[PDB]
Amino acid sequence: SGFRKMAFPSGKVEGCMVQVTCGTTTLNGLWLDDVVYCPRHVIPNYEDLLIRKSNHNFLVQAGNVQLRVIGHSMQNCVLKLKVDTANPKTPKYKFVRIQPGQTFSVLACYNGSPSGVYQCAMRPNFTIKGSFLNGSCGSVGFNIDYDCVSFCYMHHMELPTGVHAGTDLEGNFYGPFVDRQTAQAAGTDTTITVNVLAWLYAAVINGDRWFLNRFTTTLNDFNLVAMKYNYEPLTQDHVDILGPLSAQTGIAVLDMCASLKELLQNGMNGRTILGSALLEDEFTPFDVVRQCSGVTF
């Protein structure tokens, strides 16, 4: 029993975190094999700024050891620093680009030292509601599948509303953001419908059934209602993805959609679901299945 916001064990990622200094700027880098990956803003015409730098201008520190930079190149908004030593702690890994609604673990670092781990989701407006201070740039997002670390995010900046923006590990931003000081704002955000439904199934599994009702709905009628509460549209793919949870609890996806519709129109009425007075949207269907089954890494 119990339902927590759970992150992946961070050990395989901790052994990759390094500190990168260029002039007055200090941030975090990801050391995999003989390459250190970090935001290109550590150095705007970034090719003109980069051409003026030499390998020795980049100071890379792995723990108490100084790593020697032997080359450098830029890929989109990510700088790749070729180092003379391969990371002996390099895990099995892939660089993956995630979609809005998907969740991941963030290892927040300052000065190449990991300070915390938390779980979060890529919002529909491509921002993340993270917890970051100055010096956190270069901190990474990841998932783990068996023994393979899938790196999906690298932190670049904070938006005026306090939310965060970054890139995949190939340097492509999530969202219409650019790496520079200019007027940028997060777009209007929406609730991840498929994730709220998964969390309602997790509440049923944990013995919370007060919100269930005898009713059902069509996908069209549910989507007409959901659009009015700034909820993301629910697709047939989402319905198919929720199939296992529907079979386990005995509540059809459109039966659970009718429960969600009543919660949106009437509220919780002084009640909570899994210790929350709000509808939670940062657990995917796979997160619910994994936490209510005990998958290990």
Residues 210-229 within binding reach of ligand RAQ (CB under 6 A): none
Q: Which does 156 bind (CB under 5 to 8 A by kind): Cl ion, ligand RAQ, its own copies, none?
A: ligand RAQ
5 binds its own copies (CB under 8 A): yes
Which of 93, 95, 83, 82 has the alpha carbon at shortest distance from 169? 95
Q: Which residues pair with 59 in a beta bridge?
A: 21
Q: Is 16 a catalytic residue?
A: no
We find the least distance from the C-beta atom of residue 135 to ligand RAQ, in angstroms, to be 8
The answer to whether 192 and 158 have CB atoms below 8 angstroms apart is no
For residues 43 and 122, which CB has a smaller minimum distance to its own copies in the complex? 122
Q: Which residues pair with 166 in a beta bridge?
A: 155
CA dist., res. 136 & res. 265, Å (int): 40
Tokens of 118: 């938390």
Residues 27-86 within binding reach of its own copies (CB under 8 A): none
Span from 43-51, 178-186, 212-220, 285-293 in contact with its own copies (CB under 8 A): 285-293
Residues 180-199 within binding reach of ligand RAQ (CB under 6 A): 180-181
Q: Is 152 a catalytic residue?
A: no
CA dist., res. 172 & res. 166, Å (int): 8
Query: According to CB under 8 A, which one of 23, 44, 162, 187 is a site residue for its own copies?
Result: 162
The answer to whether 216 and 258 have CB atoms below 8 angstroms apart is yes
Residues 13-42 within binding reach of ligand RAQ (CB under 6 A): 41
We find the least distance from the C-beta atom of residue 103 to ligand RAQ, in angstroms, to be 20
Tokens of 254: 């459109």
137 binds ligand RAQ (CB under 6 A): yes
179 binds ligand RAQ (CB under 6 A): yes
CA–CA–CA angle 230, 244, 201 (5° rounding): 50
Tally of CB atoms within 10 A around 97: 13
Q: Which does 118 bind (CB under 5 to 8 A by kind): its own copies, ligand RAQ, Cl ion, none?
A: its own copies
CA dist., res. 249 & res. 245, Å (int): 6
152: exposed, middle or buried (C-beta count within 10 Å: 0-12, 13-18, 19+)? buried
Which of 91, 268, 279 has the alpha carbon at shortest distance from 194? 279
Residue ranges binding its own copies (CB under 8 A): 1-12, 14-15, 107-111, 113-118, 120, 129-133, 135-136, 158, 162-164, 206-207, 272, 275-278, 290-297
Catalytic center residues: 41, 137
Residue ranges binding ligand RAQ (CB under 6 A): 1, 41, 132-134, 136-137, 156-158, 160, 164, 179-181
